[PDB]
Design a protein around this motif. Structure first.
Motif, PDB file in Angstrom:
ATOM      1  N   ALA B  35       4.245 -14.450   5.980  1.00 43.23           N
ATOM      2  CA  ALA B  35       4.135 -12.554   5.869  1.00 43.23           C
ATOM      3  C   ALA B  35       5.413 -11.953   4.793  1.00 43.23           C
ATOM      4  O   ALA B  35       5.635 -11.973   3.373  1.00 43.23           O
ATOM      5  N   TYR B  42       3.464 -10.322  -2.696  1.00 40.65           N
ATOM      6  CA  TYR B  42       3.039  -9.173  -3.311  1.00 40.65           C
ATOM      7  C   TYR B  42       3.783  -8.962  -4.371  1.00 40.65           C
ATOM      8  O   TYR B  42       3.534  -8.598  -5.084  1.00 40.65           O
TER       9      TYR B  42
ATOM     10  N   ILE C  34       1.498  -8.360   8.734  1.00 46.95           N
ATOM     11  CA  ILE C  34       1.391  -7.949   7.964  1.00 46.95           C
ATOM     12  C   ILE C  34       1.136  -9.106   7.007  1.00 46.95           C
ATOM     13  O   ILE C  34       1.289  -8.894   5.675  1.00 46.95           O
ATOM     14  N   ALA C  35       1.148 -10.552   7.348  1.00 45.89           N
ATOM     15  CA  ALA C  35       0.854 -11.789   6.261  1.00 45.89           C
ATOM     16  C   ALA C  35      -0.423 -11.118   5.409  1.00 45.89           C
ATOM     17  O   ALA C  35      -0.737 -11.166   4.193  1.00 45.89           O
ATOM     18  N   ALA C  38      -0.038  -7.880   3.772  1.00 48.08           N
ATOM     19  CA  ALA C  38       0.962  -8.006   2.224  1.00 48.08           C
ATOM     20  C   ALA C  38      -0.260  -8.934   1.507  1.00 48.08           C
ATOM     21  O   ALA C  38      -0.037  -8.039  -0.139  1.00 48.08           O
ATOM     22  N   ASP C  39      -0.973  -9.373   1.779  1.00 42.97           N
ATOM     23  CA  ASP C  39      -2.042 -10.161   1.006  1.00 42.97           C
ATOM     24  C   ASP C  39      -3.576  -9.279   0.738  1.00 42.97           C
ATOM     25  O   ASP C  39      -3.217  -9.119  -0.638  1.00 42.97           O
ATOM     26  N   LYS C  41      -1.825  -6.000   0.024  1.00 36.71           N
ATOM     27  CA  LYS C  41      -1.323  -5.373  -0.901  1.00 36.71           C
ATOM     28  C   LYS C  41      -1.441  -6.632  -2.036  1.00 36.71           C
ATOM     29  O   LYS C  41      -1.974  -5.928  -2.785  1.00 36.71           O
ATOM     30  N   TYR C  42      -1.377  -7.607  -2.004  1.00 40.93           N
ATOM     31  CA  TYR C  42      -1.097  -8.642  -3.086  1.00 40.93           C
ATOM     32  C   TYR C  42      -2.327  -8.447  -3.659  1.00 40.93           C
ATOM     33  O   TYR C  42      -2.250  -8.392  -4.941  1.00 40.93           O
ATOM     34  N   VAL C  45      -1.765  -4.821  -5.740  1.00 39.88           N
ATOM     35  CA  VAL C  45      -1.684  -4.797  -7.086  1.00 39.88           C
ATOM     36  C   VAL C  45      -1.845  -5.842  -7.584  1.00 39.88           C
ATOM     37  O   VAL C  45      -1.495  -5.832  -8.715  1.00 39.88           O
ATOM     38  N   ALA C  46      -2.266  -7.749  -7.346  1.00 40.50           N
ATOM     39  CA  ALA C  46      -2.577  -8.394  -7.642  1.00 40.50           C
ATOM     40  C   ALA C  46      -4.003  -8.410  -9.332  1.00 40.50           C
ATOM     41  O   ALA C  46      -4.012  -8.506  -9.616  1.00 40.50           O
TER      42      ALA C  46
END
Lengths: 160, 55, 55
Positions: B35, B42, C34-35, C38-39, C41-42, C45-46
């Motif tokens: 994370a 992120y 979250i890991a 966040a990925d 979301k990564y 966003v990515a």
């Protein structure tokens, strides 16, 4: 395998000795001088770094390149010369600002890949397009496609 | 003996729980570090997105 | 009784570790959430980084 040179040649004897004395904690003694990865996060803290648990793991991920379970002297001093620059001065901003102007003959504010290429080809070695891009990208911390004055002063620090 | 066996089972169990706990600590930390990097990554792409969006 | 007192300290310890384990288990599902998030979301966003960069 020349990177270790920055790591050792830029240190005074007492700086190398403080780094080594702390590094030697990696072996209990009366063994084989193994130097295990287990004490690496701790030594970075012994020497003045203040890494988080993630950062302690990154120090481990960046060492033990041969899969031996140990940290060699270059792997350790090479990370530190890029973290805790306890060097023999490593020259200065004034010296490097003079070189910067020698490259930046037009006062453009930066050194592009062509000026970088010319100095390297002028050295007698054969230089490729990737060789010049790699130095430009190492100096170009802000990803603007060039090494600027401030970036240049940081870029060539600790070089002989 | 019940209390002593109680302790042997419980102490061993308390240790098993300490180990499961340590394991959850290690795992949440690894996951947390994933994370930290997943969030860091992120942030790099989100920041780059802002830069790229700005561009 | 002493053996139970010892046992209660270690039973309590097992419980402290059970509680920590459970807290840590929650933190693990959340640290890993979250890991993954966040990925997730990564990628959101990515993906935008790629779409916006393409744009």
């Amino acid at each position: 395998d020349d990177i270790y040179k920055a790591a050792v040649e830029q240190l005074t004897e007492e700086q190398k000795n403080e780094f080594k004395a702390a590094f030697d904690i990696f072996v209990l003694g009366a063994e084989d001088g193994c130097i295990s990865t287990k004490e690496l996060g701790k030594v970075m803290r012994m020497l003045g770094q203040n890494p988080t648990p993630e950062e302690l793991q990154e120090m481990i991920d960046e060492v033990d390149e041969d899969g031996s379970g140990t940290v060699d002297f270059d792997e350790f001093l090479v990370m530190m010369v890029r973290c805790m620059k306890d060097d023999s001065k490593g020259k200065s901003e004034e010296e490097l600002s003079d070189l910067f102007r020698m490259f930046d003959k037009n006062a453009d504010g930066y050194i592009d890949l062509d000026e970088l290429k010319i100095m390297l080809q002028a050295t007698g070695e054969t230089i490729t397009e990737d060789d010049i891009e790699e130095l430009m990208k190492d100096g170009d911390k802000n990803n603007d496609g060039r090494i600027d004055y401030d970036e240049f002063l940081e870029f060539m620090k600790g070089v002989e | 003996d019940e209390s002593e066996r109680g302790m042997k089972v419980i102490e061993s169990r308390a240790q098993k729980d300490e180990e499961k706990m340590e394991i959850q600590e290690i795992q949440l930390k690894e996951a947390k570090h994933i994370a930290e990097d997943a969030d860091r990554k992120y942030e790099e792409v989100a920041r780059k997105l802002v830069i790229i969006e700005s561009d």
